[PDB]
Design a protein around this ligand. Structure first.
Ligand SMILES: C[C@H]1Cc2ccccc2N1C(=O)Cc1nc(N2CCOCC2)cc(=O)[nH]1
Length: 759
């Protein structure tokens, strides 16, 4: 009744009064309508069935002839006593639950769910036990799974307690009219001709650019803007992609007072009113009905040919779009680009993305948050979609919050991002409290890192480590750093902080290595996190999400290349978290017993995998080496050394620290020796690896457009190595999109020979 308003303010890092002090009708209208939208979603959520609630709160953690049957440990809610019994690998959770209730009575299964001990996870649904991530990881590490039988009533109890004339302007400076990236007229247009998404872009210069400012010609209520407007500029020539809202720093920002002449109130024609009304481009526009009927996927090309300045062509295009059938995910993601800015085009693109699954949405969520930067008005279809999907799934809501929270320091998005988070919080009061615990933990991690930064300059490395340990052992710090959901994976619980296992890197920004343990979770609760303050993790997150996509796409064609796309999450201004892949070490640390460096990797794997286990480790290495050889070549991952390439004790080879991408790969004889089983020349084993590399490269080539589309949507992020058209050009060259399957295979073989030649 009083705290919520201050709770949101502390969580978002901005006071709610700052939105009210703006005296903006658009801001207030978004706040009232989205609060209503999010509260209704929260009400529907409180009436869900116990499994439907689990599908929201604990979404299934799944993996992307037998012969097998493995052991399991099961306990109940009240009693501490556990029952150990062997079950089948093919068996479903209901079979385990029925077996658990039989052993309980001696010492109905449909009314239960299997809680994963010391983890924010549940084992439910019609899936074989081996398909669940927890059981699979337990099987691949020789661990006994610990589960708890939780009755339907208990899940509902948890659900209940977690409730809530030519255009003219008087310049009182370069002016230009835009409908996205293309000029509507000269830097020459009628008022009736003006489209709904028309932008008036300014540039103040002396050659030396000073500042820029953009504005919408129509308001959020569809009415044409009149008359006087003070434009607070952003520092810089003409920038149409930039935000339509002024600089919040009114004290130092240069302004631009302009007057919009009163032509008559004039509102843009409504839906029903619209419905009534070089040589290649003209031919495509002529065949607009044939494209609507026979080629629906060619909509993007049809929107690029239509005259956005001519109002007759726009209304003609809109009627075709109003009757246009549903388009695939790939085509819909292409339409969210700044080249297609029309509101009705955006609404059609969102409706085509309603068929996305929670897992599909999660993969593109990073790009969807980036599209919000291109949005002109606060109340848009993308915001309604993201909020609605985040309210339906707690894991989606988690990452949507963190993706917006990490950009709060940026003034251009702080208002939009802060309002969406406030709306989400009105929808989920309990999850808001859960995220506050994560925010308070990161607050103490920042303070601890600041302390380590100062202490390192004053004393030696082991003295700074004991200094770090004393700071952690503080009552407030121990409570804040412990018993929370992992921001990198909400399914993982960060229980007891292991102060003695915690350390720092003696280099520039001094990153922290934080270790955790869990009595309840056992060995699964042993988790590590790298906290980085001062280094930017946006480029690292993108590269890892692309490697994850590569892995997903390969698996969709039946190819498992045993990749390691570990979690990376920026949380604030040059602040973020990295997931520690335990039981893994760098090539450099392994090199620091092999007589020669070419034998180092195999010798290390021999000691970790003795006997028959070695053959699997060699296969794990070969598949992962092939996967990363293609991944590093395609994405253009440079600055590669022995300290940024890691290997798991199980065999898997993986890359770390992605500071430079998009402009050849690392194929050292250290890798070849493991692939060839230790033999000087093993053609059979190397040609299979070459074959696996060729297969990996060809599967990505067919999905080349998807990589290009996602990299095009990531131009909004403001990445230094991904901002212009020439940056994405590396993917066109590396994947060889113009070439055919055999033309690119010969090109890749020369590059494969080149990486092996210079070794
Ligand atoms: C060099 C290691 C040891 C260490 C100790 C304290 C703080 C940071 C770090 N480290 C790093 O920051 C390196 C580093 N490690 C990374 N890893 C992610 C995969 O799991 C293993 C760790 C990813 C990455 O991008 N950089």
């Amino acid at each position: 009744k009083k705290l919520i308003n201050s709770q949101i303010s502390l969580l978002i890092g901005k006071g709610l009064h700052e939105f009210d002090s703006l005296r903006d009708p658009e801001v207030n209208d978004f706040r009232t309508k989205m609060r209503q939208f999010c509260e209704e979603a929260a009400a529907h959520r409180q009436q869900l069935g116990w499994v439907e609630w689990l599908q929201y709160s604990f979404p299934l953690q799944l993996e992307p002839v037998s012969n097998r049957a493995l052991l399991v440990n099961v306990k109940f809610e009240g009693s501490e006593e556990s029952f150990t019994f062997q079950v089948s690998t093919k068996d479903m959770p209901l079979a385990l639950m029925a077996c658990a209730l039989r052993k309980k009575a001696t010492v109905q299964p449909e009314e239960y769910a299997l809680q994963v001990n010391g983890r924010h996870e549940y084992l439910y649904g019609n899936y074989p036990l081996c398909h669940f991530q927890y059981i699979c990881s337990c099987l691949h590490s020789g661990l006994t799974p610990h589960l708890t039988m939780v009755h339907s009533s208990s899940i509902l109890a948890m659900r209940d307690e977690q409730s809530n004339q030519p255009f003219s302007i008087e310049l009182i400076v370069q002016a230009g009219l835009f409908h996205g990236n293309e000029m509507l007229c000269k830097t020459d247009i009628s008022v009736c001709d003006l489209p709904r998404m028309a932008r008036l872009c300014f540039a103040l210069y002396a050659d030396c650019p000073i500042a820029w400012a953009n504005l919408m010609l129509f308001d959020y209520k569809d009415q044409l803007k009149t008359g006087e407007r003070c434009l607070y500029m952003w520092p810089s020539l003409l920038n149409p992609a930039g935000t339509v809202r002024g600089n919040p720093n009114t004290e130092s920002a240069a302004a631009l007072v302009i007057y919009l002449p009163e032509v008559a109130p004039v509102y843009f024609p409504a839906l029903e009113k619209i419905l009534e009304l070089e040589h290649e481009k003209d031919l495509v526009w002529k065949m607009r009905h044939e494209v609507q009927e026979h080629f629906p996927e060619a909509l993007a090309r049809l929107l690029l040919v239509t005259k956005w300045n001519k109002h007759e062509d726009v209304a003609q295009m809109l009627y075709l779009l109003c009757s246009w059938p549903e388009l695939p995910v790939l085509s819909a993601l292409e339409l969210l680009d700044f080249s297609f800015p029309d509101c009705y085009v955006g609404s059609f693109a969102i409706k085509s993305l309603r068929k996305l699954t929670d897992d599909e949405l999660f993969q593109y969520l990073l790009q969807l948050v980036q599209v919000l930067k291109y949005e002109s008005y606060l109340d848009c279809e993308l915001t309604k979609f993201l909020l609605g999907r985040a309210l339906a799934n707690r894991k989606i809501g988690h990452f949507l919050f963190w993706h917006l929270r990490s950009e709060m320091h940026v003034p251009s998005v702080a208002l939009r991002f802060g309002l969406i988070m406030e709306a989400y919080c009105r929808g989920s009061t309990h999850h808001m409290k859960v995220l506050m615990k994560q925010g308070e933990a990161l607050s103490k991690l920042k303070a601890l890192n600041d302390f380590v930064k100062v202490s390192s300059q004053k004393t030696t490395k082991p003295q700074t480590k004991e200094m770090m340990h004393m700071c952690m052992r503080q009552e407030t710090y121990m409570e804040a750093l412990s018993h929370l959901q992992s921001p990198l994976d909400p399914s993982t619980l960060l229980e007891e902080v292991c102060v003695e296992q915690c350390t720092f890197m003696d280099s520039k920004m001094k990153p922290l290595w934080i270790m955790y343990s869990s009595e309840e979770a056992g060995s699964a609760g042993n988790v590590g996190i790298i906290f980085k303050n001062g280094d930017d993790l946006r480029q690292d997150m993108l590269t890892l999400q692309m490697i994850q996509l590569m892995d997903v796409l390969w698996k969709q064609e039946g190819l498992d290349l045993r990749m390691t796309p570990y979690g990376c999450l920026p949380t604030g201004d040059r602040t973020g978290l990295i997931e520690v892949v335990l039981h893994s070490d760098t090539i450099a640390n392994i090199q620091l017993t092999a007589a020669f460096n070419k034998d180092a990797l195999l010798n290390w794997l021999k000691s970790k995998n003795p006997g028959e286990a070695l053959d699997r480790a060699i296969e794990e290495f070969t598949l992962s080496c092939a996967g990363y050889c293609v991944a590093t070549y395609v994405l253009g991952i440079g600055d590669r050394h022995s300290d940024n390439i890691m290997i798991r004790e199980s065999g898997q080879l993986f890359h770390i620290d992605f500071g430079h991408f998009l402009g050849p790969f690392i194929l050292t004889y250290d890798f070849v020796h493991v692939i060839q089983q230790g033999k000087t020349n093993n053609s059979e084993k190397f040609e299979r690896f070459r074959g696996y590399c060729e297969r990996a490269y060809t599967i990505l080539r067919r999905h080349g457009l998807l990589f290009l589309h996602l990299f095009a949507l990531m131009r909004a992020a403001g990445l230094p190595e991904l901002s212009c058209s020439k940056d994405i050009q590396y993917l066109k060259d590396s994947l060889a999109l113009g070439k055919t399957e055999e033309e690119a295979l010969k090109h890749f073989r020369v590059k494969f020979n080149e990486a092996l030649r210079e070794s």
